Ligand binder design. Structure first.
Ligand code: CL
Ligand code: CL
Ligand code: CL
Ligand code: CL
Ligand code: CL
Ligand code: CL
Ligand code: CL
Ligand code: NA
Length: 129
């Protein structure tokens, strides 16, 4: 599924991400924009052989099982395929674990490089929320 901007803002808010760990909804929308372009089926293979999955490009090294990332963990206790669903519940629940891990949203390199410190409220401007 390719979400619209305001459509994803609303889904993220419905699933409790707005101000989760102190990060406003615009931070989450921005991260999703640059990680996936709002596409649930986004995948990206890393040089280390791990894969990133879904709207927030969650990595198989720690967070999900894909059976092809040697030495990895599955801390969200999900198949990485669950992160590609039209239903963002698994992505959101797993994102709450990641952002709790100690480094906040710096876990998402694209958030650090493209969202952090910017006017992220622009990402939810105009949306009925
Ligand atoms: Cl957009
Ligand atoms: Cl915001
Ligand atoms: Cl594996
Ligand atoms: Cl594990
Ligand atoms: Cl699995
Ligand atoms: Cl959803
Ligand atoms: Cl933080
Ligand atoms: Na894994």
């Amino acid at each position: 599924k390719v979400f619209g901007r305001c459509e994803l803002a609303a889904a993220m808010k419905r699933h409790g991400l707005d101000n989760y760990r102190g990060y406003s909804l615009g931070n989450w929308v921005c991260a999703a924009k640059f990680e996936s372009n709002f596409n649930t089926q986004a995948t990206n293979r890393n040089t280390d052989g791990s894969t990133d999955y879904g709207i927030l490009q969650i990595n198989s090294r720690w967070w999900c099982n894909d059976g092809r990332t040697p030495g990895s963990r599955n801390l969200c206790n999900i198949p990485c395929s669950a992160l590609l669903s039209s239903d963002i519940t698994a992505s959101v629940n797993c994102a709450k674990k990641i952002v709790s891990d100690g480094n906040g949203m710096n876990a998402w390199v694209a958030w650090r490089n493209r969202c952090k410190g910017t006017d992220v409220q622009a990402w939810i401007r105009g949306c009925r929320l």
